[PDB]
């Protein structure tokens, strides 16, 4: 169907694709001459013909792939109809002809590119698929489901009474390949189509579930694993679909995992299946005692699968303190238990968990005594809500095993005491130190095995992290003499652990470690002067001891230590110990670090200038790129991109250190500000492939400015920085980042002061604010038959801050710009999060009688809000009514005095949750009483009074005691005073001057007696107040 010349030109080109020369010439020819408005359809026509008809595998394959790629880019929609049709017809004839399997696969994928919403109907495809599904050739059946997977909309197009049997036969097909493709197609439908379409295939789920036992009958567990993977996707999409056969699937996964002649894939995916219900349907799991019971049971079974064929654990005793990556099911079981416990709570799982543990702790099989320890370790955090109270009980089970004949059970027990020191902190440190420490300490002796000494030393890190110096104090000498022994090990990992454990114990001990400094420090210096991680962990230990004992003591070895660092730095795991150590010395040395900046800063400057290392990449070339932990690939705007992730993580780390030097050294860091701002902070906002970088760029901004301030350029840099921040608001996709930019502007404004913004900036900020609010609304009006966002609340919380901050810097002038997004604001005002936001904005508006334009638009809702069941709404509401009487005294009276009774009732309240809201109302009424002073029908003020003291909201308290400073005589006097003592002592707020005058009006003895109620500690404060 092409001119014969064109054919062998194109044939030559495509054949050249499979040498540099012949192949590059073809590549240029193709991309520069043939993929153009004029030749595109010829090219597509050619490639479709080759894929359809070529007798050569390679040419057919390549053309199928090329066609697929180019057909998108064209795109297929702007192709002439006569040519689309010819392409379609040959593609279809190719599919139905005799091709090798992999070519049929590629044809299927090519065909899919020719089916489209806007594209003319292709009912010949529909017909071809239906017939192929009945073919006696598996590859035809498989390939048809593949097309239904690529183009799930075709499933909508086929008659419901044809498509139903299609899938039922599919699930039941004698070919495994066909089954997997049927299942894949079936789930893909839900992946791709709206939920309103789901109910139409939903009904097939039981046939699918019913087909599952056949995989175990034929012994086809690998294919079972693949189906489990599809089913895992379906659970995440429509968990409730599973409700009616929930017990059946639970029981099935149970059966699989128990059969331990099966290979791991079926078993791990089956566990995953079970696990994922807790993440997507927690109420469904909780409403069924069976789920919990099965899930605990199976993970306990899998956790025992360790040191197989090695009862002494010889191999484990002889290795380092890392995981044996061969123990896969054991690793999976821990993670699963952990994940479900975190989702379901202890309320639901502790009982079934413990039912088993009581028994496994007592077994003669060591593997089960171990399993017990590791399971508790996995579940402890998730079950803390319950287990935090059964702490003596838990230690009673665990601690007796610390001395188990088997070293792995001992390690296991170490592990639990470690895990729970973290998960029940800080309560466990306070109450079980007397049992935990001796237990761990006893394992440290060189009598025990290296792995056990090491793990006990590790668990002392967990414990130390949350133990006060006073608790650790009596145990230090013993802890230390033991760890020195571990320091003398032959095994690199024991020394490494020893060092870190000492470091962290020293960190917790603080000044209590001063007496150990002289024994430790020289042992450490000797190690250093002599093995990279050793030296690093050693420098880490030295500098953390330094921070513990303080600068004066640290000064006995600082110069020598410093000289060693220098030698070490200028001589890759080590690099990170070095950088943190310098950083810790800066915290010790204070301003005396200044002369070290030339040594420490340059390396960080290099790393923090790292560029977005991106490789524009091809489909195939991307999953093996993905294998590396240090790389990731995404699809951004149509293309495939390879990004070097590690490098960008390192950029962040370096940015964080520069930020922390800047923070501590203030004015002394100024010399670096211009450079870090222009070469690091700002360019980092444009790092669209890594959000950490973007955020780290943002937080660096106000801190850099503030350094330069403390030491005109400042005004330039601020203008540049603010403008890119502002610009970022309207382009930044990620809500979490958007927040950082607003916050960052707030902090910038705070630094730069009065009138730090220009008119265009104020306008460009408004657009940003609006696009941010628009996209929040859109995401939120999306939140069921099939299924059971502080990120949003937090963003709006910060937007409030920036607006307020912008208002303040403009000194009101931002009212003008603020008007344009009033419709936006208004929608919000009339879903609680959006309401609170709107109210908060309006309170800021009134702060700057020019708002009458809107009195009518909001007081109806505000008055409503006053009596809302939600405390946060009442709070913001009352503040608004109070701010009305403060800044707009007269354009508001007809409202403020009526509502005043509402406020006396909202007041009645004094409880943590709403102490704040009732304090705002209290302040709100004091504002009204001020503005319209001798105009009120006065019980009121004596009501108000009984709402004192104000202890929680600071700005409220600030007004109430200002108003109190403008009740007399009587025996209100002790309530007058205490009202103030309480505010002061609670640190919530010259009202003192006023009080002294009242006490002046009474004798020596009458004056004194008021403080008679007050304890010593607050009488110390009172003396220093009056």
């Amino acid at each position: 169907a092409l001119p014969e010349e064109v054919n062998r030109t194109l044939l030559q080109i495509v054949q050249a694709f499979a040498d540099n020369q012949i192949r590059s010439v073809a590549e240029k020819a193709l991309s520069e001459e043939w993929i153009t408005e004029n030749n595109i359809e010829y090219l597509l026509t050619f490639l479709a013909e080759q894929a359809a008809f070529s007798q050569d595998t390679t040419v057919a394959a390549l053309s199928a792939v090329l066609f697929r790629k180019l057909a998108l880019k064209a795109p297929i929609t702007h192709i002439r109809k006569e040519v689309l049709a010819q392409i379609r017809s040959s593609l279809l004839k190719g599919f139905l002809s005799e091709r090798a399997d992999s070519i049929r696969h590629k044809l299927s994928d090519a065909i899919a590119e020719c089916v489209q919403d806007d594209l003319p109907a292709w009912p010949e495809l529909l017909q071809a698929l239906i017939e192929s599904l009945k073919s006696g050739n598996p590859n035809f059946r498989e390939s048809s489901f593949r097309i239904l997977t690529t183009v799930p909309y075709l499933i909508t197009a086929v008659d419901i009474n044809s498509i139903l049997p299609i899938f039922q036969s599919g699930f039941t097909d004698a070919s495994d390949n066909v089954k997997i493709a049927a299942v894949t197609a079936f789930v893909g439908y839900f992946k791709q189509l709206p939920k309103s379409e789901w109910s139409k295939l939903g009904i097939l789920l039981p046939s699918l579930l019913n087909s599952l036992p056949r995989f175990l009958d034929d012994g086809k567990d690998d294919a079972l694993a693949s189906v489990f993977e599809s089913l895992i996707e379906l659970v995440e999409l429509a968990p409730k679909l599973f409700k009616d056969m929930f017990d059946q699937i639970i029981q099935f996964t149970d059966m699989v995992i128990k059969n331990k002649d099966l290979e791991p894939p079926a078993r791990t995916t089956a566990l995953e299946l079970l696990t994922v219900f807790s993440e997507n349907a927690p109420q469904m799991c909780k409403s069924n005692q069976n789920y919990g019971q099965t899930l605990v049971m199976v993970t306990l079974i899998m956790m025992t699968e360790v040191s197989i064929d090695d009862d002494d654990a010889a191999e484990w005793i002889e290795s380092d303190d890392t995981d044996d990556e061969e123990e896969v099911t054991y690793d999976h079981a821990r993670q699963a238990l952990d994940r479900v416990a975190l989702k379901l709570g202890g309320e639901y799982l502790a009982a079934p968990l413990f039912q088993y543990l009581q028994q496994m702790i007592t077994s003669t099989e060591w593997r089960e005594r171990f399993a017990a320890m590791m399971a508790l370790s996995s579940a402890a955090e998730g079950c803390a809500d319950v287990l935090i109270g059964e702490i003596p009980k838990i230690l009673d089970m665990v601690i007796p095993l610390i001395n188990d004949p088997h070293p792995r059970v001992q390690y296991g027990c170490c592990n639990v005491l470690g895990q729970i020191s973290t998960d029940f902190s800080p309560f466990i440190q306070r109450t079980a130190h007397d049992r935990i420490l001796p237990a761990l300490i006893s394992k440290l002796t060189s009598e025990c095995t290296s792995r056990v000494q090491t793990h006990a030393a590790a668990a002392l890190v967990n414990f130390s992290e949350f133990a006060s110096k006073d608790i650790l104090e009596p145990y230090l000498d013993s802890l230390l003499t033991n760890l020195l022994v571990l320091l003398q090990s032959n095994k690199l990992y024991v020394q490494e652990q020893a060092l870190t454990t000492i470091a962290f114990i020293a960190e917790a001990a603080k000044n209590k470690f001063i007496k150990y400094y002289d024994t430790l420090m020289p042992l450490l210096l000797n190690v250093l002067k002599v093995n990279s991680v050793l030296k690093g962990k050693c420098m880490e230990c030295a500098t953390l001891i330094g921070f513990a004992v303080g600068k004066e003591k640290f000064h006995e070895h600082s110069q020598e230590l410093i000289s060693i660092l220098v030698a070490l730095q200028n001589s890759d795991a080590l690099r990170s110990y070095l950088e943190q150590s310098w950083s810790r010395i800066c915290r010790i040395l204070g301003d005396d670090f200044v002369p070290l900046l030339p040594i420490v800063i340059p390396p960080l400057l290099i790393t923090a200038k790292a560029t977005q290392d991106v490789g524009l990449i091809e489909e195939e070339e991307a999953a093996n790129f993905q294998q590396y932990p240090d790389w990731d690939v995404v699809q951004v705007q149509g293309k495939h991109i390879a990004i070097h992730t590690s490098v960008l993580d390192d950029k962040v780390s370096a940015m964080e250190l520069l930020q922390s030097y800047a923070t501590l050294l203030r004015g002394q860091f100024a010399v670096y500000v211009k450079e870090v701002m222009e070469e690091i902070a700002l360019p980092s906002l444009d790092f669209y492939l890594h959000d950490g970088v973007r955020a780290a760029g943002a937080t660096l901004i106000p801190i850099l400015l503030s350094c330069l301030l403390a030491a005109e350029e400042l005004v330039l840099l601020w203008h540049k920085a603010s403008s890119k921040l502002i610009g970022g608001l309207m382009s930044e996709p990620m809500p979490e980042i958007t927040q950082v930019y607003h916050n960052s502007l707030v902090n910038g404004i705070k630094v730069m002061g009065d009138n730090c913004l220009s008119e265009d900036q104020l306008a460009a900020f408004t657009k940003g604010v609006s696009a941010n609010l628009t996209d929040t609304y859109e995401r939120m009006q999306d939140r069921d038959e099939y299924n059971e966002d502080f990120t949003d609340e937090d963003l709006l919380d910060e937007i409030n801050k920036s607006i307020a901050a912008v208002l303040k810097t403009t000194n009101g002038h931002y009212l003008k710009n603020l008007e344009n997004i009033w419709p936006m604001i208004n929608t919000f005002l009339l879903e609680p999060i959006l309401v609170i936001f709107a109210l908060v904005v309006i309170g800021d508006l009134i702060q700057y009688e020019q708002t009458a334009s809107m009195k009518n638009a909001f007081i109806p809702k505000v008055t409503e809000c006053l009596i809302s069941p939600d405390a946060r709404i009442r709070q913001a509401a009352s503040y608004i009514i109070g701010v009305c009487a403060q800044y707009a005294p007269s354009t508001y009276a007809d409202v403020c005095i009526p509502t005043l009774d509402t406020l006396v009732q909202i007041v009645d309240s004094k409880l943590e949750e709403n102490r704040s809201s009732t304090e705002n109302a209290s302040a709100a009424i004091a504002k009204i009483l001020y503005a319209y002073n001798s105009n009120i029908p006065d019980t009121y003020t004596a009501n108000w009074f009984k709402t004192l003291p104000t202890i929680t909201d600071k700005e409220a308290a600030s007004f109430n005691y200002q108003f109190l400073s403008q009740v007399c005589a009587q025996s209100n006097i002790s309530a007058v005073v205490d009202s103030v003592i309480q505010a002061l002592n609670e640190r919530s707020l010259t009202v003192i001057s006023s009080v002294k005058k009242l006490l002046g009006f009474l004798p020596s003895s009458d004056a004194m007696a008021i403080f008679n109620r007050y304890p010593a500690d607050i009488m110390e404060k009172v003396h220093k107040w009056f």
Partner: peptide, 8 residues
């Protein structure tokens, strides 16, 4: 280092 639980 420490006692913790991975997640991979």
């Amino acid at each position: 280092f420490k006692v913790s639980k991975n997640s991979t």
